[PDB]
Amino acid sequence: SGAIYVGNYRVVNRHLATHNDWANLVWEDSSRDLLVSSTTAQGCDTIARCDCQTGVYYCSSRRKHYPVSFSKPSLIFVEASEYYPARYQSHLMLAVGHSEPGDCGGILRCQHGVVGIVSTGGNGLVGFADVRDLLWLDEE
């Protein structure tokens, strides 16, 4: 589990969104595994605006943050899970690292701010849904 809290937005994995998220919906995209809902309180996270390929992510199944090198956001075929059939997921970045299903939502960050959240994994890989292209998270 986990979310990004930037401005009056909450960014979560679409497959983990609650009824309150869907009832306060700003934007959602199944192909990216992302959903954004509105918040009453202002958040403290800031979004990175960059092309970094090195950063640190939080792994809840280890209670640890790990430094990683990750690929650029791409269209990747992801195997079936409890939440999606096997399909192409867009804007996805891969790294070598531990992940389990409940690690979704952990933040990946670089020197510039939040880069994305854990969305996929297995066999020593972790995949992150990028948010750096969503410029509108910084305003309104």
Ligand X SMILES: O=C(NCCc1cocn1)c1ccccc1
Residue numbers in the known binding site for Zn(2+) are 50, 52, 110, 112
Q: Provide the minimum distance between the beta carbon of 115 and Zn ion in the complex, in angstroms, as a whole number.
A: 7
The alpha carbon dihedral of 57, 47, 127, 73 has a sign of: negative
Cβ contacts of residue 58 below 8 Å, gap of 6+? 2, 64, 65, 106, 107, 118
Report how far apart, in Å, the C-alpha atoms of 96 and of each of 71, 99, 123, 139 are.
10, 9, 9, 33
Pick the binder of Zn ion from 3, 48, 78, 104 (CB under 5 A).
Answer: 48
Pick the binder of ligand X from 21, 35, 89, 97 (CB under 6 A).
Answer: 89
Q: By CB under 5 A, what part of segment 94-123 binds Zn ion?
A: 110, 112
Rounded to the nearest angstrom, the gap between the alpha carbon of residue 46 and the centroid of all alpha carbons in its chain is 14
Answer with the entry of Zn ion, ligand X, none that 112 interacts with (C-beta below 5 to 8 A by kind).
Zn ion
Q: What is the largest CA-CA distance in the chain?
A: 40
The two three-digit tokens of residue 50, written as one number: 């960059």
Pick the binder of Zn ion from 26, 52, 56, 76 (CB under 5 A).
Answer: 52
Instruction: Please tell me whether residue 59 binds Zn ion under the rule CB under 5 A.
Output: no
Instruction: Please tell me whether residue 56 binds Zn ion under the rule CB under 5 A.
Output: no
The alpha carbon dihedral of 69, 72, 77, 79 has a sign of: positive
Pick the binder of ligand X from 93, 99, 106, 115 (CB under 6 A).
Answer: 99
- Is residue 45 flagged as an active site residue? no
Instruction: Please tell me whether residue 81 binds ligand X under the rule CB under 6 A.
Output: yes
The two three-digit tokens of residue 95, written as one number: 């790294």
Q: Would you tell me which residues interact with ligand X (CB under 6 A)?
A: 15, 33, 78, 81, 83-84, 89, 99-101, 103-104, 119-122
Catalytic residue numbers read 15, 33, 104
